[model samples]
Target: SFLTEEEQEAIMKVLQRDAALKRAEEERYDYLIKFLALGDSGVGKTSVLYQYTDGKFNSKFITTVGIDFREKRVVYRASATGRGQRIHLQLWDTAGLERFRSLTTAFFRDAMGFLLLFDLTNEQSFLNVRNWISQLQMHAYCENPDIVLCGNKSDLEDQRVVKEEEAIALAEKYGIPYFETSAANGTNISQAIEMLLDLIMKRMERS
Candidate 1:
């Protein structure tokens, strides 16, 4: 079948308009990725978020309530796209509020990824990683959501109770990435978050 010149031009205009609309939609809805920090109280959840978002660390801890939110704009490289895109990160800090466990567990499903932190110097904190993993499995959006394990306060090696081999073993068992991070000295802090973002991005692509 053949169409007249006038009819062909009209169809072209509609196709062009549709293309424009699709481009505008993609631009307007830039990715907003939600990430949560979890671990026992005083595992440096707040400090890790502060270090990643502001690049500063306060020695004195400012206790938080059940949950706290922080925002940071980061340019992340998409593995398949081969281009860096701006992503709005909503970082949730639990603030060591285990007393309000019910309230905090409610926020687990909203996160696209997790920064599971534990104090390197605290043996109990590191040991409790198993419990936290169990909670995440039960409450997360999926059985196996993207998670990154962090052994925080690596600067305190003198008092460190959790060794690299121990943390690595746990991470391997869970099939998640692991990093030794220090919010005070900024050791692998950004790397931990970046790896989580990468994992989530890849998951997004797969989904």
Candidate 2:
């Protein structure tokens, strides 16, 4: 691959424009919400994150090597006495494989929100959700972290090895919101993001 001088300058101009826009947006927003996606391998963690960020699902599964991030601007309705406001969400997408297990603690510190995912079609992945939760609990800064349990690949009902009720029960036991979603089919993805945002906002108010 080769790039001419003209092409290089054109690319640099676009990058400069994007950088300016991001800075302007950050200056205008009041708060930044940090979210982490965690789960066992092959649980659609990356797929769900991408679907929400890009509005398009990629069929090819590529494991995140260490960590990835996406930012989205969202509007949050205020409490009874306050006015609605816009906020920037910094969504941190992380690798679910054991290769990056050592970094989990460092990644979780100061996280405001988390989505704990499990593959509905894989029993092993579902069982591993506890481990993810434990790791998060160890490093979470807030006394009660805003966490959600997500059972991914719910569209494949026929292949489901983890029952819906069981997934719901785990969430209930942990006192967190639970949702069954299909990243591939765009099912319950937006609702999941909105719910997390709502939780984060409420927590911010209380703090």
Candidate 3:
């Protein structure tokens, strides 16, 4: 759950005071870009989320149980084509285990973006990404949410079972962005995040 009871209450309080804050221009909060991370176990989903949120990579963290949510304020340049709104991302990281699949239905409705991750070192996990996509299409009311294919563990290139070209082709077939990232080495990590933001902003403009 993203919001604990205390956190929920605090958010409510902030919402109540938003009008005053907006009027003061002390903080400008734009749209909430909710993103869900889905992939099989040991695909570095949690590590990606942690790195983006806290700028730290922890290799020893346990696998995610059900669902995790983290919010970050991502600043975007005002749009050049007249829609001058800044953007903020509300990222949600989900569990990849079979038992936790059912719990994702609740999250699907609110997701504005999705990152379908796979371990480059594990071919089975890579193939299983289609199931995650199917689940999202069936349950999520995302309206063409900006989905990105993430090939993780690029650091372990020697152990890689999924080829980069194959992954890139899959993303192209689905018309989404694709990238290989190494959470350990922080390779292409920020680029992945920025690409998602760019896709979401473009989608929002079209809508």
Q: Model 1, residue 137: displacement in angstroms?
A: 0.3
Q: What lDDT score goes with residue 54 in model 1?
A: 89
**For model 3, how does the per-residue alpha-carbon lDDT over 56-122 read when each residue is reduced to its tens digit?**
8887968665666776776765355445455556677777766667765577776777888999999
> Each prediction's Cα lDDT score?
0.83, 0.79, 0.75
Alpha-carbon RMSD of each model: 15.4, 6.1, 5.6
lDDT of 2 by residue, 1-207 (tens): 353686556545644654675587567566877788888878988899888888888888787655666778877776665676878787877777675676555668746899888899999998988887787777788767888888999889899999888888888898999988989988998888778888988877776
**Ordering by TM-score:** 1, 2, 3
Q: Candidate 1, residues 2-95: lDDT per residue as tens digits?
A: 5468654654564465456446547763688888899988889999898988889999977655566777888998764577888878787775
Question: Over 4 Å off in model 1, which ranges?
Answer: 1-29
| Candidate maximizing lDDT | 1
Model 3 / residue 202 / CA error / Å: 1.2
Query: Distance from true position, residue 57, model 1, in Å?
Result: 0.8
**TM-score per candidate:** 0.84, 0.83, 0.80
Query: In model 2, what lDDT does residue 14 have?
Result: 44
lDDT of 3: 0.75
